[PDB]
DNA sequence: TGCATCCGTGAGTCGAGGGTAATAACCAGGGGGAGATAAACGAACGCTGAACGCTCC
């Protein structure tokens, strides 16, 4: 009877491991907009803006009602409550949201770091990153979905950057350098990944190659942005 | 006709500042406004999907 929800990838819902038919992208947008609010009520006004932004359909208010009605047929009675003219998600177990479950472990990683148990921090953070099932909010349209896509992609990088710092402190240089090459290729303006790559490369005895990374980074900022 | 009496009016200029008293007392009735609970409609939601199209195998 454990309800599970997925927001760190395609918008999915599970019951006892079985996938529920989460419906249209706009129905997925409605679910995501409530899930990422962590039980706070979303007014009908905020829900119209979340789904369509500045260009709502002329019958948008009826559409929200139609989408909400279909979710009630797929979700169990009482999770999606209607209060104050809006909708909220209630009665979720702890850790039912993959984002919420990852947040406790990520907060614990800060606690794990502060107690000095870097090994536990490495494993707990590792479990968090494996919860990312591809592109966040895949196939979900709308400005609110776009903003949350932006927020969680950026937030993912912060957890990777924090985990990678521990790798350099524990001597795992050779494994980390290879993955770091992909990150700087994927995030070319992200100087922090090249900083970690430069140090790891040098500690692998490739001192001459580290300065080549430096020459490339200054070039990219001067040629493309002038900074 | 004269004398005596009383009543009304006016009497500078600008400055400074706030409060005053006292004796049968009651049922009895009863009106009249000031605050407390169910009925008329239409508007949010609600599932009802049904009824249309929008992409996909």
From Swiss-Prot:
Phosphorylated by AfsK. Residues 1-91 bind DNA. The N-terminal and the C-terminal regions are independently capable of directing actinorhodin production. Belongs to the AfsR/DnrI/RedD regulatory family. Global regulatory protein for secondary metabolite formation. This is Regulatory protein AfsR. The chain holds residues 23 to 249 of 993 of the full protein.
